[model samples]
Target: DKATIPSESPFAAAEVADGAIVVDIAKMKYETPELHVKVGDTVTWINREAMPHNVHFVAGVLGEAALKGPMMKKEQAYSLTFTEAGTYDYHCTPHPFMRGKVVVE
Candidate 1:
């Protein structure tokens, strides 16, 4: 199952740092579907495929701080710093099934 695919080698840590928390968009999915990070860590999503993609937080879950990244073609990136401790779920606007989760604590 696509959802069961493991994270890339570079991000195999149990709790990743800001520099290691980059998520790659490829094959119509987020390479690291779930990531664990600390509060104040910045997570970046990099588009590795030619198809455009975006990061969109679910409505109201993050209040006014919710992130809605712009469409990104290959090699483009979107970064967001998480300041609060909670689970944030997001997806690509062009492909709702391309979901990802960030857990900050």
Candidate 2:
């Protein structure tokens, strides 16, 4: 018989608010791989790991909406308010494999 494999939840616990959501960057990954939020809601990324990291949106995907945040260290944070409804894919500049998404509706 095959060994049992636990189900995986890609997203973390909901830490959302009417106007904002907070994402934690720890262990070399974005705590929330996918996040859902309404338009006009602000998403904030907080660096909890000792290593430095930054949020960089994919070029051409968001057009003018594309944004790149400065490198953040532990306790530092970056926030962006989404006004358009679309999927925003981003990753850590230093770690391309460290990816995350924001779906605004």
Candidate 3:
């Protein structure tokens, strides 16, 4: 498990400024459902909103027991490397509709 598993899947992806998840990354939020990564899975959550926003992981069996959101601070970005494999959930604290899900496969 010393390899990184790149991912862009969202379980609860929500629409944002420009469009939806399938539309474009310009206005869509995503979560780390199963950062199925191993040792160096580099995951970056870029705030592509017109306003201030954050990315927080919803508490789950994966142990991402923290609420991150409002990551849309102009050009602010949040990155996390998964060192293991498990289901993870995340969302935006400010806008409840702004949500997503990721899986490291």
Better of 1 and 3 by TM-score: 1
Q: Per the 3 Å backbone cut-off, how many clashing residue pairs does candidate 1 have? A: 0
In Å, residue 74's CA in model 2 sits off its true spot by 0.5
For lDDT, candidate 2 versus 3, the one ahead is 2
Candidate 2, residue 58: lDDT? 63
Preferred candidate (lDDT higher): 1 or 3: 1
Q: For candidate 3, what is the lDDT?
A: 0.46
69-103 per-residue lDDT for model 2 (tens digits): 67876776667777678888999887999999989
Cα lDDT of all candidates, in order? Answer: 0.71, 0.71, 0.46
Residue-pair clashes per prediction, in order, are 0, 0, 17
- Residue-level lDDT of model 1, residues 3-82, one tens digit each, is 11122222222334445468888899999999999887777777877898888886665655545667877776666777
Q: Show model 2 residue runs off by greater than 4 Å.
A: 1-19, 64-66
Alpha-carbon RMSD of each model: 9.2, 12.6, 9.0
RMSD of 1: 9.2
